[PDB]
Amino acid sequence: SHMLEMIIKPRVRGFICVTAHPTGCEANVKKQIDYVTTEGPIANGPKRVLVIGASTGYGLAARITAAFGCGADTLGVFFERPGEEGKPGTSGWYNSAAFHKFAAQKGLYAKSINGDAFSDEIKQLTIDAIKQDLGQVDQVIYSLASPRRTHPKTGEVFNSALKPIGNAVNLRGLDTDKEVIKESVLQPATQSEIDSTVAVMGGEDWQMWIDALLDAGVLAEGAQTTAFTYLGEKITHDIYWNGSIGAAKKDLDQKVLAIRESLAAHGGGDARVSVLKAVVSQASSAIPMMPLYLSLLFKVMKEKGTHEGCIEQVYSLYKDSLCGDSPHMDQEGRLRADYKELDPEVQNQVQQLWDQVTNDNIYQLTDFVGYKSEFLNLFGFGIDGVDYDADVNPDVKIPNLIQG
Ligand SMILES: NC(=O)C1=CN([C@@H]2O[C@H](COP(=O)(O)OP(=O)(O)OC[C@H]3O[C@@H](n4cnc5c(N)ncnc54)[C@H](O)[C@@H]3O)[C@@H](O)[C@H]2O)C=CC1
Ligand SMILES: CCCCCCc1ccn(Cc2cccc(N)c2C)c(=O)c1
Ligand code: NA
Numbered sequence: 088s089h090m091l092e093m094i095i096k097p098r099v100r101g102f103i104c105v106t107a108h109p110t111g112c113e114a115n116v117k118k119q120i121d122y123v124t125t126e127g128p129i130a131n132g133p134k135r136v137l138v139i140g141a142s143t144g145y146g147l148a149a150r151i152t153a154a155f156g157c158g159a160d161t162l163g164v165f166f167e168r169p170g171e172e173g174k175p176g177t178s179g180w181y182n183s184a185a186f187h188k189f190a191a192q193k194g195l196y197a198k199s200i201n202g203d204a205f206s207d208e209i210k211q212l213t214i215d216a217i218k219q220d221l222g223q224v225d226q227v228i229y230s231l232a233s234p235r236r237t238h239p240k241t242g243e244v245f246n247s248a249l250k251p252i253g254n255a256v257n258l259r260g261l262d263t264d265k266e267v268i269k270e271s272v273l274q275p276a277t278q279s280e281i282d283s284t285v286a287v288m289g290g291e292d293w294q295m296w297i298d299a300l301l302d303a304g305v306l307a308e309g310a311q312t313t314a315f316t317y318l319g320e321k322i323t324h325d326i327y328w329n330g331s332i333g334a335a336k337k338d339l340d341q342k343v344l345a346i347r348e349s350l351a352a353h354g355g356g357d358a359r360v361s362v363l364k365a366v367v368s369q370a371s372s373a374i375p376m377m378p379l380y381l382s383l384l385f386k387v388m389k390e391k392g393t394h395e396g397c398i399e400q401v402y403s404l405y406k407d408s409l410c411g412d413s414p415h416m417d418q419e420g421r422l423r424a425d426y427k428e429l430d431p432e433v434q435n436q437v438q439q440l441w442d443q444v445t446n447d448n449i450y451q452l453t454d455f456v457g458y459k460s461e462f463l464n465l466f467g468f469g470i471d472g473v474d475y476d477a478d479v480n481p482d483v484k485i486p487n488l489i490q491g
Pocket of ligand 1: 143166232366369
C-alpha cells in the first residue's frame with residue numbers, strides 16, 4: 088500500500104503551492120467548524136443554502152457558518168482537482184471532502200458540484216440537485232474568484248487583469264520566495280482588459296445564477312443573496328478599487344439593485360454586496376504587494392486585538408448582518424464586515440510602517456511569520472497535531488459529489 092500512498096510536503100512553484108495535504112486540510116476545516124460551534128449557533132439563518140465557490144477561503148467559510156452555525160443544509164459548487172496516485176489534489180478538493188465528512192457526522196445534508204459555475208450546464212445540474220433534494224434554497228452565496236470566464240452564450244474566453252486605470256503605478260511589494268522588499272511598475276489597463284475583467288469578476292454571472300434559479304422556481308420566499316467584495320484602505324486604491332479589478336467590483340454594485348428588487352417583491356427577501364477584509368488566499372502572491380500589505384496589517388491588527396481570518400469574518404457577517412438585528416450597512420446599501428481593517432488608526436500605522444520596511448527589518452516591523460504560516464495553512468501544512476511524517480493516500484473520495 089506504500090506504492091499508493093506518499094509523504095506530502097509543500098512544493099512552491101513560482102509563488103503557487105502545487106501540493107495540498109489531505110489530513111491538514113481536514114484539520115483546517117475542523118478548526119473552522121470548532122470556531123463556529125465554540126462561538127455558538129446563529130439565530131434566524133437560512134436553512135437551505137447554495138454556495139457558489141464553496142471549497143476554499145470565504146465561500147468555504149460561508150458554507151461552514153451556514154451549516155454549523157445556522158444548521159443549514161448546503162449545496163456547494165466549486166472547481167477543484169481530485170487527488171490521484173502520486174499527485175495531490177487541490178486544497179479545495181480536500182477541504183470539501185472534510186466538509187462532507189463533518190456534515191454527515193452532524194446529520195446535515197452536504198452535496199457538491201465540481202465544474203465551471205460560469206456554464207449553463209453546471210447551473211442546470213445545480214437546479215436539478217435543489218429540485219431532487221431541497222425543493223428550494225433560502226440563500227445564495229456568490230463567492231467565485233477566477234482569472235478567466237468562458238461566456239456561456241457566446242463561447243468567448245475573457246481573461247481578468249490586475250492593473251491600474253489611467254496612469255501606471257509604482258507598487259511596493261514583498262517577494263515571498265527571495266524575501267526581498269522590492270517595487271515594480273504596472274502599466275495602465277487597456278479598455279479591452281477593463282471589459283474582460285468586468286466580464287470575469289463583475290456581476291453578470293451572479294445575475295445569470297439568480298435568474299436561472301428563479302426561472303426554474305427554486306428560490307424560497309424571503310430568500311437572500313450576497314456576493315463578496317473588497318474596498319480596502321487608500322493604500323490599495325490605485326491597484327484595486329480604482330483599477331481593473333475595482334471596475335469589476337463596481338459592476339457588482341450595479342447588479343445588486345436589480346437582484347434586490349426581484350427578491351424584495353418575493354416575500355421581502357434581500358440582496359447585498361458584502362464587503363470583507365483582506366486575508367491570505369491562494370492568489371495572495373499574485374502581486375507581491377499583497378504579502379507586504381497582509382504582513383503589515385496582521386501585525387497592526389494583532390496589536391489591537393482585531394486580527395481575523397475567513398471564518399471569523401463570515402461568522403460575524405452572518406450573525407451581525409445577514410441574520411442579525413443590527414445590519415452594519417454603508418451609504419451605498421452594502422453590508423460591511425471590513426471596518427476593523429479600515430479604522431483610521433490602523434491605516435495610519437500600516438501606512439507609516441510601509442515606507443520603513445527593508446530587507447533587514449521585515450521580521451521586526453511585520454508579521455511576515457504569520458503571513459507565511461497562514462499561507463501554508465491554506466494547503467493543509469504547518470497544522471497542529473497533524474503527523475507530517477505519515478504516508479497518506481492522495482486519492483480522497485467525496486460522496487454526493489456531482490462531477491460536471
Ligand atoms: N481574499 C481576500 O482578501 C478577499 C476576497 N474577497 C472576494 O471574496 C470572493 C471569494 O474570494 P476568495 O475567498 O479569496 O477566493 P478563493 O480562491 O479562496 O475561492 C474561490 C472559489 O471559487 C471557486 N471557483 C473558481 N472558479 C470557479 C469556476 N469557474 N466554477 C466554479 N467554481 C469556481 C473555487 O473553487 C473556490 O471555491 C471573491 O469575490 C473575492 O474577490 C473579498 C474581500 C477580500
Ligand atoms: C494588495 C492586497 C490587497 C488586496 C487584498 C484583498 C483581496 C485579495 C484577493 N482578491 C481576489 C482577487 C484579487 C486580485 C486578482 C484576482 N484575480 C483575484 C481573484 C480580492 O478581491 C481582494
Ligand atoms: Na471563496
